[PDB]
Design a protein around this nucleic acid. Sequence first.
RNA 1: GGAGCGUCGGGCCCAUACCCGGCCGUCGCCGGCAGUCGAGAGUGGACGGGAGCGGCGGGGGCGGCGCGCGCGCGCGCCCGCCCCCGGAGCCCCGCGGACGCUACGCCGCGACGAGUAGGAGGGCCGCUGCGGUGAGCCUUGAAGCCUAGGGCGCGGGCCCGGG
RNA 2: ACCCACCCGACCCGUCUUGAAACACGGACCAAGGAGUCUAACACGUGCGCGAGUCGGGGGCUCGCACGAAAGCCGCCGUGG
RNA 3: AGAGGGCGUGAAACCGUUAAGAGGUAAACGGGUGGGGUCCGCGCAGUCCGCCCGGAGGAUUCAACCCGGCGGCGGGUCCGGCCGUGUCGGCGGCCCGGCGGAUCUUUCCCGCGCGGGGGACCGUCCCCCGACCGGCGACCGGCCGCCGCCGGGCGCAUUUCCA
Lengths: 128, 147, 125, 53, 187, 225
Amino acid sequence: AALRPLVKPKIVKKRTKKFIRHQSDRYVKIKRNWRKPRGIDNRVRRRFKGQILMPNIGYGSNKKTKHMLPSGFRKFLVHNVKELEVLLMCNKSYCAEIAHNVSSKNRKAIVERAAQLAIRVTNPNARL
Amino acid sequence: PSRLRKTRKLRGHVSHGHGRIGKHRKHPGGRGNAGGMHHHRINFDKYHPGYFGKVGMRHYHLKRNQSFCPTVNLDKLWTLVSEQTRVNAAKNKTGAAPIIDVVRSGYYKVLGKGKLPKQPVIVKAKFFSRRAEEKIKGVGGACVLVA
Amino acid sequence: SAHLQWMVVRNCSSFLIKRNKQTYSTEPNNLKARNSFRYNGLIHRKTVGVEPAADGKGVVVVMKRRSGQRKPATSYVRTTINKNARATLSSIRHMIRKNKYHPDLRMAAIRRASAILRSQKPVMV
Amino acid sequence: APSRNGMILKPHFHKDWQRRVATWFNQPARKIRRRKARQARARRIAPRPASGP
Amino acid sequence: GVDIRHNKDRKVRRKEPKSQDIYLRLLVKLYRFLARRTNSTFNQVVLKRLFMSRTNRPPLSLSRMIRKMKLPGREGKTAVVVGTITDDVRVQEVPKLKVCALRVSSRARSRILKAGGKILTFDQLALDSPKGCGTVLLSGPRKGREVYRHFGKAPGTPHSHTKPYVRSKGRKFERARGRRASRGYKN
Amino acid sequence: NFAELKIKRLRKKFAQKMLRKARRKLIYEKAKHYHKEYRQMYRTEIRMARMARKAGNFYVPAEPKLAFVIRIRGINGVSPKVRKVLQLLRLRQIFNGTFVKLNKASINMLRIVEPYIAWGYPNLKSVNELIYKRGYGKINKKRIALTDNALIARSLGKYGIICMEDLIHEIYTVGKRFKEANNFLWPFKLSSPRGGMKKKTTHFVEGEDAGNREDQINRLIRRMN
RNA sequence: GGAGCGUCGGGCCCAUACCCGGCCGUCGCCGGCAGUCGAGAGUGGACGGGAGCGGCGGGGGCGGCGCGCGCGCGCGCCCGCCCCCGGAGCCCCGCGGACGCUACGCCGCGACGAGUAGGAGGGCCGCUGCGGUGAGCCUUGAAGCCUAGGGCGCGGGCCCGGG
RNA sequence: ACCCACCCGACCCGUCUUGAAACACGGACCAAGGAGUCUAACACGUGCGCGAGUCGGGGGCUCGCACGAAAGCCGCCGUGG
RNA sequence: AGAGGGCGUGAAACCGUUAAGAGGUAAACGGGUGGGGUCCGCGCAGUCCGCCCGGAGGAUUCAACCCGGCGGCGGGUCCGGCCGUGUCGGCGGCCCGGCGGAUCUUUCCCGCGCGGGGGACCGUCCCCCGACCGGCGACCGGCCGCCGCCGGGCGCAUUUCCA
Ligand SMILES: [Mg+2]
Ligand SMILES: [Mg+2]
Ligand SMILES: [Mg+2]
Ligand SMILES: [Mg+2]
Ligand SMILES: [Mg+2]
Ligand SMILES: [Mg+2]
Ligand SMILES: [Mg+2]
Ligand SMILES: [Mg+2]
Ligand SMILES: [Mg+2]
Ligand SMILES: [Mg+2]
Ligand SMILES: [Mg+2]
Ligand SMILES: [Mg+2]
Ligand SMILES: [Mg+2]
Ligand SMILES: [Mg+2]
Ligand SMILES: [Mg+2]
Ligand SMILES: [Mg+2]
Ligand SMILES: [Mg+2]
Ligand SMILES: [Mg+2]
Ligand SMILES: [Mg+2]
Ligand SMILES: [Mg+2]
Ligand SMILES: [Mg+2]
Ligand SMILES: [Mg+2]
């Protein structure tokens, strides 16, 4: 019996796999991080068959469910308690994420306030 | 602001906006205004007609203060004086006409552009144009030469 | 004016908080936490604000005078309502509706009150 | 190489000008130094006009 | 596939003003509303002009305003100017006017009020006459900027009277081969 | 104040309803009338011929006033003059159709784009199918579907064209106001020909799909529409 | 007795082409919305005298400009009224106005989307330092580093868990 | 997202080139460094201030500069451009 | 000392080992599924909540109503007074109102025809009261109407609570 979101639509994604960078498989100097290839002869940049795909705006997500977590909320990086009381009037549609840097003593304080306010925390059971 | 300049967007692109056929070589024309007569001739002789060649008289030890002769047009002669000269006149009933020393306000010649208002004036100046004189006479005034 | 100082403040205020694709506003007497024109406590001649009470029990409504802003010490006037939920809401509803005071907020103010009241009771299992 | 209309202009940066660039970061300290000196002379020439003659 | 040139698909006209000043944006906000909701095209012209550049909304002189309102019929009428009203020192007798402008220079303001005129801001014009009824919409001369003397058919091209860009005019800055017939040729 | 206004508002509401009723009946009688007209047209072409055949005689019927023109090949590598004509007929995409009124001028244009089109003289049915199934009006430059008469009337009502039936009548008969009603019909986005084609590249007469196939455009229209 | 060659049928196979639908973006709409009636819109409203089942007794037009949900009407009783939303109860409401309205916002309809060299726009993309600002975070563990952990974004990237 | 399987697709990038998977050159691998800058001059575009003006320098007056080598002011406000 | 004297943090290339999985078309790659693992969320029914309503059980105190007080809103009579815009009257500040002026006067004064100061004049800025008007978020005082809070009363067909 966790916090349901207001409306929980079927999130559909056009593509799930990460776009990866050309020849990032062949080298350790090349990272996965996408770059558009700007070679003159380039299988990829001229859209040949059977190559890695190039990201367009065509793959963009449907505005209704963009940034929507699997639970149905969108994140909002809460940093301290005072910054939670913002979400008070949303709680059905956004969720607090508490930051990495926040100490274990005041993570505890944020979580209990959220629970009072019925704001969904996305990483509550963690630091301890 | 480098932030706002172009080269920030060109990161990634190979030639850096100078094209890869012809490159950004060092000095392809010749440096500066080279080739005015040969090979940049068209530019110079359809945007700087008259560049090349001499004309007129030399004048060796020119000094500009000799030829100093700033001008004022009748158009705005009354602007030299405070409004209440132009007002206390078109009034008065003596047919007085106030004096406008043009040289005081920093002009030597009184040229003839513009309508003058029907209101007499004594204008003191170093030089006058013919028409500038005639206008003042017709208003009902007097030109006054001054050294 | 109102609209002028909104143009000054719309993007720069300390109270504003962006991050993570949302925007919010922490300025007091903004019920709904929004960076809106409508919902912004500082700008408007007439303002509503529904905070919780410092007791732990009840809600406080915070209505702005008009008499004299310029003098922030006296500007806002507060009033605790420590009543049976339904009545608490009706008290705030009248305050807004029957006074003709910022009827834009009416329902938003009621929702806030409702959320405050939810927040202050026995929690869960 | 000139390109379609402009001032056919002749900048004088063909000598070793960067050897002889004279910056002006002094000027404040200069102005202060002058004003201090000026105030000293006034104090020396006691009831005389600071101006000079 | 479909053959259309996608070349001149996007129209280039301005939508909002590029300026960030808050008062001008408030005026725009006002005049957007009036433009769409009214049927007046006055509001639509005023809106369009609020977006345009400094160059593009030149200053109207006093004298040019006077003479445009001197014209037979537009009497007891408000002159409207999206730019600035400046003085003419070479005009003296200034009638009593009604003037709307984004700015009026101090000297021009004195001149107009002294004569018994009125000066309106654009918000005041909206409350007075929302649909621009009884207005003479003017502009300053667009082609006044020196800049336009350098444009056109290039100099050194027969029958072109185009100011060439020259570091300094004088006996020996141009005016030889290509201007004198005595030196080579002339256009 | 109150009941006087209310009654006035109710009166207005009825007056409106009456008007809509009256317009609806008008439409209904125009459709009835065009039904009778088409019936008479069809019969009287037979009537004539039979009377010619009774004598040792022939009835050459009227050369056809209107034709449907389908672009049947694509948009790559197309001559400049051909390309211009195609976009004067409103045939940018492949498999767009349009009605075209025939005349010395128009026919010579169809000839300059022969190998790029199939065309012929459409049936009444063909005109109905096209307009109803794939009729979209050019309304403030927005391709919009003709879901109600209100649209057609709004644009064409100044020509005595006030319903889909009138539109069909004007297109089929090639009336005074053909140009205007035709231009108002956005070009017909037909699908590919089910059952395929014979040969896109060659003329009908020599086995292909291109060129004038007169009567036989109707068969093509069914398989695409 | 083709899985060859010439002439011809039906049938079927599939492209990023065509059609219908979804979703992303771009362009365009004198696009809409700062709070109002109204869908081929072709009026609304005083107010005064005279009256009333009267009306405006005009085209096989097939019809748009006039007609059958009322104009006068039921009630108080031929005369009066035909009344006020702090209450008509509402499909239109002109008395006040979004859940919506960061108006650099929000919303609606169309159309369209290859791209080297090159140009332009937007980056809540990223790095380092400065003025402001977050009653920010931090030995109850900052930076960095690592991670077959969980997620977000078209993407540049980012956020969380564990070490 | 780690591994493995299978069907279909699929040649190595960068580069000059009409044309590169090339029997064209550079490149074993990884880390860190690494190339459109600044000044001056012009031009056009845009934003802001003032407008027949505009202007700021250079200088001067106000402080030991904590922040200041700033900020402010000047019949110098206009010699002058 | 998972900080051991070239010792903070300790990346990659590269190597050892441990675990898992595979292995005749060099490997690696894109699309699509499947199999196995790793952890992550569950559930030892997840049948998820929220309004309103009806019932049957228990629960305290009030809403409704007035009375007393406090505070707030809005209103017109602008009623009374403060407040300020445009206009008119005072020529009243004008010398008890200053600056500016190539307006004037050397009838003046002082210093040497000029400088400084008066004195006229013009432009600009301030007092007095009356009248008209925008009666403007620029405020007070009473009166009115409404709202809210507190305190009195109202004991139970109302009043919320709880399951
Ligand atoms: Mg190539
Ligand atoms: Mg490129
Ligand atoms: Mg370039
Ligand atoms: Mg190169
Ligand atoms: Mg080159
Ligand atoms: Mg070459
Ligand atoms: Mg000196
Ligand atoms: Mg293109
Ligand atoms: Mg373009
Ligand atoms: Mg071809
Ligand atoms: Mg493209
Ligand atoms: Mg290559
Ligand atoms: Mg070879
Ligand atoms: Mg080589
Ligand atoms: Mg090598
Ligand atoms: Mg590096
Ligand atoms: Mg400029
Ligand atoms: Mg250590
Ligand atoms: Mg160390
Ligand atoms: Mg170490
Ligand atoms: Mg290993
Ligand atoms: Mg093994």
